[PDB]
Amino acid sequence: FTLIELMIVVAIIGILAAIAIPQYQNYVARSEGASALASVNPLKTTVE
Amino acid sequence: FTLIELMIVVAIIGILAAIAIPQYQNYVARSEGASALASVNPLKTTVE
């Protein structure tokens, strides 16, 4: 009778369907690069 | 969900588009040169 309780649980393991968003790391990378420009931009203004 | 808040911020870093006006220093230079004539001009008049 427990087999059916597991049927959902087999499903539950299954359904997760948005896990590995790697290039999350790559909008993170864009954030890190543009926001790496944020670090320097008033120093343009400072040299000048 | 924060990625979009950053999308503007990536932009915001970007948009600044009139920063390095170097030859500002060179109308400054013209000011400094002509206004360097201002310093002496009544001394023409004084020698004479």
UniProtKB/Swiss-Prot annotation, chains A, B:
Modification N-methylphenylalanine occurs at: 1
Membrane spanning residue stretches: 1-21
Locations listed in the record: Fimbrium; Membrane
Signal peptide: none
Family that this chain belongs to: Belongs to the N-Me-Phe pilin family.
Subunit record text: The pili are polar flexible filaments of about 5.4 nanometers diameter and 2.5 micrometers average length; they consist of only a single polypeptide chain arranged in a helical configuration of five subunits per turn in the assembled pilus.
Protein name: Fimbrial protein
Biological source species: Pseudomonas aeruginosa
Gene encoding the protein: pilA
